[PDB]
Amino acid sequence: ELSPSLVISLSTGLSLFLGRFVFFNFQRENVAKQVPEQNGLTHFEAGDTRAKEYVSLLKSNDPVGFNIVDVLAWGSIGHIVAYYILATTSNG
Amino acid sequence: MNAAYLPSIFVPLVGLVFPAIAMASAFLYIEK
Amino acid sequence: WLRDFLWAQSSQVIQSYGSALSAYGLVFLGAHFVWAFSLMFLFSGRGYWQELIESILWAHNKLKVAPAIQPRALSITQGRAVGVAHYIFGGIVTTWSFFLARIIAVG
Amino acid sequence: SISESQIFIAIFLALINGFLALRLGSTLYNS
Amino acid sequence: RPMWYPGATAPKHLDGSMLGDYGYDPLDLGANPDSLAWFREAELMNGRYAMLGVMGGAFVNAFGLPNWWEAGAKVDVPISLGVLIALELAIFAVFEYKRYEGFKKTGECGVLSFMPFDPLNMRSEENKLKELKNGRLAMVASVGFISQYLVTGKGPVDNLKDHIVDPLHNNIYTSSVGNEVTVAIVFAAMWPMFAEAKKALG
Amino acid sequence: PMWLVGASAPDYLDGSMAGDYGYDPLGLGSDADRLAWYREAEKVNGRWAMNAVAGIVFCELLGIQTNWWEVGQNPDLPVDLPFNALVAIEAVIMGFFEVKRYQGWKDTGMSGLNDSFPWDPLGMTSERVELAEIKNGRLAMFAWTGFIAQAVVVRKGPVACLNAHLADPFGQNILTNVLNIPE
Amino acid sequence: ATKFPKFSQGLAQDPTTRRIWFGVATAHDFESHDSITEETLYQKIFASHFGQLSIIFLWTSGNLFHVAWQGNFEAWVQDPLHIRPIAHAIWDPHFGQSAVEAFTRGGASGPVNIATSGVYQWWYTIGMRTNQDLYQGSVFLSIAAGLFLIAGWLHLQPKFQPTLSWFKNAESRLNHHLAGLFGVSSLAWTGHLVHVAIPESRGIHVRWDNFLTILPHPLGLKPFFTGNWSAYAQNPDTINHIFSTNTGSGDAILTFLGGFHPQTQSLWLTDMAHHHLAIAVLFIIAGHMYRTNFGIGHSMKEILDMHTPPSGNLGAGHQNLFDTINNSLHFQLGLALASAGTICSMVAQHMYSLPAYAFIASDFTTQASLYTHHQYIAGFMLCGAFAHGAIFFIRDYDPVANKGNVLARILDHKEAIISHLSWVSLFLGFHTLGLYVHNDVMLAFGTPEKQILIEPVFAQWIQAAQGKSLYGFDFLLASSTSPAFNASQTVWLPGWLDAINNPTNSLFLTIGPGDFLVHHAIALGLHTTTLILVKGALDARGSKLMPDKKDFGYSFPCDGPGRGGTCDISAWDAFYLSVFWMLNTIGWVTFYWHWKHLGIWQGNVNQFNESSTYLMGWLRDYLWLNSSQLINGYNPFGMNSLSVWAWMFLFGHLVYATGFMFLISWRGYWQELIETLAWAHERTPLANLVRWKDKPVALSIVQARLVGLAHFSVGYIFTYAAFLIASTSGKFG
């Protein structure tokens, strides 16, 4: 219950902040613009089974719909800033 | 090494025998 | 034949620079270059060389320097002749330089 | 110093890698 | 059709037609590029002459102990070199010349119609599998009698008693090739599945 | 009952396959042809490991075999047959059933069995208890992996672990005794 | 199809032997068969990779097993410097009493090959120290390879046969191969280093028995999880640390001190453990970039399609490229060889100068045999990167969908690229040779004072930036003032400035005039090799002479002796000519690497930088001295231990010399000769009865050149492979 367990708890809140604060705007805005496909067709109907673009796991009642994998994508960045700040001790 | 008698058994088999069989069988398959 | 002859006998020609017969040391190598140069004409073939000249003309055209006698790569039998010309030439001139430098020193 | 026993174990183990190739090379050429 | 339990499919080459057939043909030799039933005799003559083989080396450990590997060594009989072999050369060929040259001409049943040797022929031909089956089994033990000398060296029965005295400690798995066999046992457990995955997964 | 909250919709599975929470995150449940095969490997791994816990628990809880990983290394087995032999002895008689229960599986009957067809000698239930199959199974396999992490980190079998946590809750747990090495 | 070339009916029916020859060489080309659908083409390929991947493992299990069985290891482990590593024994039924004895050099009883492969140290610097470990390890690769031959068999059946679009999903591979293949492996490898190699470096035996009973570090993961990561770096080793024992041995695990490990004169292991552990973290992060089923990620194409620069300099920029790439295989393969090819060389550039493995750069000849391997094997791969670059343009490139793309802009100017490579390759041509000849004459007439000598200023100042103080410069790491030396003074400077300033290790060898002139020859060889290959690609489509080559095939002999007698007009014949230059520009390198090192291994820098300028020293000094040891192998006075290589060095020429018979003499001569023989054998008695099924014929035009260039190379390699090994085995540097 001290700084090592406090900072990573205090650091992660930084990235999840920005993700929902604003960058929920821009990430969602490129995802709508960017979708994978091959031969002009996406990977489901070209015959690839494992490639079906999978939203059925991705939903929430969160006010903006912020979902599990965006928690994973931002929380991981929250843990980047985490282990840069504590682990370095390099020039302050 | 304790196995010492092996090379005398294999090398002739793999230097002659196998190249003798793989010479015959691979030939007979060129024409059918 | 490598050890007792070419290797052994050729230690007369190689050690001569600044000596009277040093001109054999230059020719000795000079006959290698011309020999190895022959292989270019024997191994290659025309149509690769005529395609390449098509590019270089684009350079001279772009600078408006194109000549009025159109460059054409050597004909087939032309390239074969200039291939033998050097392969033999460069190869005989070695033994010429290899003998004289040998014996003029020794004999 | 390798025990003579282990040696034949390996050679027999590599003997199986000889048949799985023959089974592959057939099925691949048979296509 | 017990057929050595690979699972279902045997190759067509062995359907159960010839006697004793469990439909085991790993190497496609049971095919007929020249013939097959020639192998049957070749099996049978091997088998016949094999099953009677053990009897010589078997009982000799139990009686006087000139055991088979040491048996043909010590005797007083052979008379000045060639007489030892030369007598045994003729008598086989002369009758085998008959049956070998004959029964690949006089018909494919090796000494079955039994014209050279007339049995009591009371039971005759139906159970003939059982002969073939009882010898094939002795064929496999015959290999063992080799390794009984090679691995151990004790007589077949002198090996039996050791297995009877100490059943746990007399196994092959301890001595020598034990390390080798215990691997050939493992790789023989998956053996039926690979053969089965051809059919099922294909 | 979806496996998290809502969402979790697999078009391919209805759930008639025995038990469902809707849980297939990666999508291995597609191309339902082989999904049959994935079904009854879960059954087996459940139907199998579920014993291996009780196998470890029972003896370690009440009986011999305390450490259970060093067992087979230790002395004095109830049967002293050697290591080199006993391996063969294991696989061959497993080999009969495992091939046979497969050929019965690949046989028209898709369900489990042993010794050719007969499966239920008592004939208890094909439904509710049959759903207790996979629920207890999915927990049993899950329960197994713990035993691994008990031996690696703490290097003390569950019985001591289950005795160690209710003794010291805050000095003995996943996070404490990982960061604290001195087993 | 019945007869041998089952996959093509044009060959399947041939009366001649050309059915036989092409039947072998047309096999692995899967775009051409009877009917090859898009789906079943990917099938045989992905099965074949299981073939290559399984073949490699067995090949490794052999090396392990032999050294474990026919070779010495323990005896070498005890005395790495003063004893030779042994490879498989020499079994020939053909020997005299002398040659047997003369080859029994080693610790073993029989005749054996001192192993110049180099694999023998990479086991010890990973560390093993029992023949058991090698055998234990040589079994897995035998087992593990068996899993692919299973897998190979397993994925060709209808049920497990993967769908086509499974192969064309390129965003899943990258995510997996980056994180899973590259990244996750790097974790496991630092796992091995920290748990096995590094403690065993300090003389602590850890195996799969005692593995988890012994901490790799005195702390727990407390420092790792508290976030405090300087413990692992807190206690490095001593300068006098003796390898594979405990003397003053530091306790640290992840450090980097720069420089070497003076006992072994190799890299610090903690320094490598820190390395892969960083690379592991980079890839794993960089494998989440591309989108998969989870819909978060990137789309390969809509990354590209937005890169058309907002000017039009590139026109449409990258547009419909993800079409061509994901469709064309050869495009994907041209990149693969080009990317992997350069790295092969990059390996050889670092691995001699930064000798990762312990107790190499001590035994020299195992560096030479390596550095040349990875240069040549890097040469062939690039020459194949361009060939499949041509097969791309000749077949699966589409000018319509690519209109205005970046590929089409290049074809729009073919000549500019072709013409300028023709200038640079000539500039380096005249001037680099022009100086060697000038230096030759001046030293011939006896005044070397007249020579042209240029000091390689830049690569000197680059070594000045690196901090080599032998020059007068003092910028960056060379000057203790600069805001670089002050930055890294605390971490990797102190060690790495010792290695660079201690002129024994080959890190940044001192350069000079001979060094200067050679790097232009090297630079020449790279251009004329590209000039050929860049031409064959851009003219694969067509040129002014024959603009049908797109539709005339890829490899074809010629268009006939019309309109000027086309010959070598194709794009295969263009590649064909590159190899001959590939073998020079690599030959120049491997020469220039060898004889700069020879002097340094022999303790003198003056054999090179004095005589390196004029071309006679190369012949007079490097070639003449080295040949004396090699030719004495077969000497009629007796067999040396180099008599192995004395013979092969001759076998190397005779193949090379055979290679001219195919390259020079062309077909029509031989076809009229066979006519006379097929007449004689036909009308001679006693041979009437015995006749040929397949009517013999002089082999095809292209077939000869291909056969010709095989002899040329096989001969070109075995001479230099024998000269290099037996020069450094004869002298020992």
Ligand SMILES: CCCCCCCCCCCCCCCCCC(=O)OC[C@H](CO[C@@H]1O[C@H](CO[C@H]2O[C@H](CO)[C@H](O)[C@H](O)[C@H]2O)[C@H](O)[C@H](O)[C@H]1O)OC(=O)CCCCCCCCCCCCCCCCC
């Ligand atoms: C690695 C070897 C294994 C280990 C060593 C084992 C020892 C090697 C023993 C040699 C065994 C093979 C001998 C091959 C000789 C035949 C070569 C030949 O006539 O082959 C020529 C073929 C002929 O070309 C093909 O010819 C074909 C002929 O048409 C046929 O194909 C058409 C296409 O469908 C139609 O089917 C038509 O009906 C039918 O006629 C088509 O024209 C194809 O388009 C065309 O590609 O060319 C090709 O495709 C070219 C393919 C080869 C490219 C690789 C060349 C690389 C050069 C070697 C590099 C130097 C290596 C030295 C190494 C030294 C270090 C040790």
Ligand code: CLA
């Ligand atoms: C590709 C790897 C490879 C290579 C190049 C060699 C090379 C050699 N081995 Mg060998 N070996 C290998 C792997 C390899 N080994 C493995 C994995 C084993 C474990 C079984 C052995 C076991 C072995 C023994 C026991 C002996 C040799 C011997 C030899 C030497 C004589 C050749 C011989 O008898 O081989 C015969 C080898 C075998 C029959 C083993 C199977 C072949 C291996 C797996 C290589 C197969 C790869 C090859 C591409 C398969 C293609 C075959 C065909 C399609 C062309 C020669 C130096 C002999 C020796 O040292 O005498 C001086 C010898 O006595 N080897």
Ligand code: CLA
């Ligand atoms: C090896 C045992 C095993 C196998 C074969 C399966 C197989 C299956 N499960 Mg299942 N499951 C298991 C164990 C297993 N499960 C365990 C232990 C749990 C408790 C967590 C669950 C909980 C569970 C739920 C809640 C549901 C399923 C469902 C399904 C089916 C659909 C998924 C599918 O097709 O993917 C096929 C999946 C596999 C082939 C498994 C691959 C596993 C990889 C290879 C290894 C992973 C290792 C792991 C990461 C390390 C340990 C982690 C530890 C913390 C547990 C499928 C037949 C769904 C259903 O109803 O269908 C009937 C469903 O809703 N499973």
Ligand code: CLA
């Ligand atoms: C984590 C998941 C994972 C993993 C591990 C792999 C692994 C592999 N896949 Mg694969 N794949 C995956 C997911 C995965 N795949 C998925 C999801 C798909 C579907 C999109 C595919 C589709 C796929 C196809 C279609 C193919 C593969 C292939 C391969 C193999 C490439 C050959 C290889 O290993 O190069 C060996 C190289 C390395 C191990 C590292 C090389 C790194 C660079 C080059 C050098 C670094 C090493 C170091 C610097 C040098 C020192 C070495 C040391 C000895 C001294 C490899 C076994 C190919 C194959 O071989 O067929 C089986 C193939 O054809 N995969």
Ligand code: CLA
């Ligand atoms: C992983 C790398 C890789 C892969 C997958 C391929 C794949 C392919 N290449 Mg390719 N190539 C590569 C690397 C690769 N190449 C490299 C590195 C080069 C430069 C050397 C080339 C140069 C090249 C050319 C020039 C051509 C191909 C062609 C082909 C296609 C058919 C190959 C064929 O028919 O072979 C069948 C098998 C053989 C021909 C075996 C012949 C044996 C050769 C000549 C070597 C003989 C020397 C031998 C080693 C000496 C032994 C020494 C000993 C006796 C002492 C196929 C798509 C051909 C193609 O697509 O044409 C349409 C084609 O023309 N490639």
Ligand code: CLA
């Ligand atoms: C040692 C032999 C040798 C030499 C010198 C060359 C030289 C050359 N080749 Mg070549 N080649 C060779 C062997 C050789 N090749 C072989 C064996 C092959 C395999 C078939 C090839 C295949 C090949 C291809 C495929 C290509 C070349 C190219 C080139 C040019 C590259 C640029 C360069 O370096 O210019 C340097 C030029 C020289 C050093 C010429 C020296 C002559 C002096 C300076 C002038 C004459 C001296 C004196 C005045 C003569 C007096 C004669 C007397 C009658 C008065 C150049 C002309 C490429 C090209 O076209 O480049 C544009 C190209 O595409 N060659």
Ligand SMILES: CC1=CCCC(C)(C)[C@H]1/C=C/C(C)=C/C=C/C(C)=C/C=C/C=C(C)/C=C/C=C(C)/C=C/C1=C(C)CCCC1(C)C
């Ligand atoms: C100016 C200058 C001269 C002298 C000093 C110095 C040289 C340093 C230099 C300093 C310049 C600097 C640091 C300028 C920046 C000032 C800053 C950061 C001002 C920020 C003000 C913050 C404001 C309004 C917040 C408004 C409301 C917000 C977010 C609501 C956000 C929310 C959303 C919608 C997402 C979830 C979380 C939450 C909180 C519910």
Ligand SMILES: CC1=CCCC(C)(C)[C@H]1/C=C/C(C)=C/C=C/C(C)=C/C=C/C=C(C)/C=C/C=C(C)/C=C/C1=C(C)CCCC1(C)C
């Ligand atoms: C319901 C609720 C209450 C009130 C409203 C509110 C919106 C706040 C809502 C919030 C609920 C909360 C607290 C949600 C928190 C979610 C969190 C923290 C999820 C965690 C995400 C982090 C993850 C997966 C880890 C990713 C990867 C990591 C670390 C790895 C780091 C690494 C280390 C340092 C070693 C190796 C290298 C690498 C990989 C860089």
Ligand SMILES: CC1=CCCC(C)(C)[C@H]1/C=C/C(C)=C/C=C/C(C)=C/C=C/C=C(C)/C=C/C=C(C)/C=C/C1=C(C)CCCC1(C)C
């Ligand atoms: C001809 C062909 C057929 C059709 C398609 C295909 C693409 C295959 C096409 C192309 C084929 C091939 C193989 C093309 C190119 C091959 C080659 C030689 C690629 C090599 C590229 C080298 C590159 C980038 C080097 C870039 C710069 C580097 C390292 C140095 C960077 C650095 C400097 C200089 C100082 C140190 C620090 C730092 C900043 C990292």
Ligand SMILES: CC1=C(C/C=C(\C)CCC[C@H](C)CCC[C@H](C)CCCC(C)C)C(=O)c2ccccc2C1=O
């Ligand atoms: C290299 C080569 C060429 C290219 C070589 C060419 C085109 C020779 C042309 C060079 C000449 C000698 C330049 C002549 C310069 C003029 C005489 C002008 C000089 C005026 C003063 C400077 C003296 C072929 O055309 C060729 C054709 C067929 C088979 C093999 C080959 C072949 O190997």
Ligand code: SF4
């Ligand atoms: S050699 Fe081949 S290419 Fe040159 S002309 Fe005669 S046929 Fe045409």
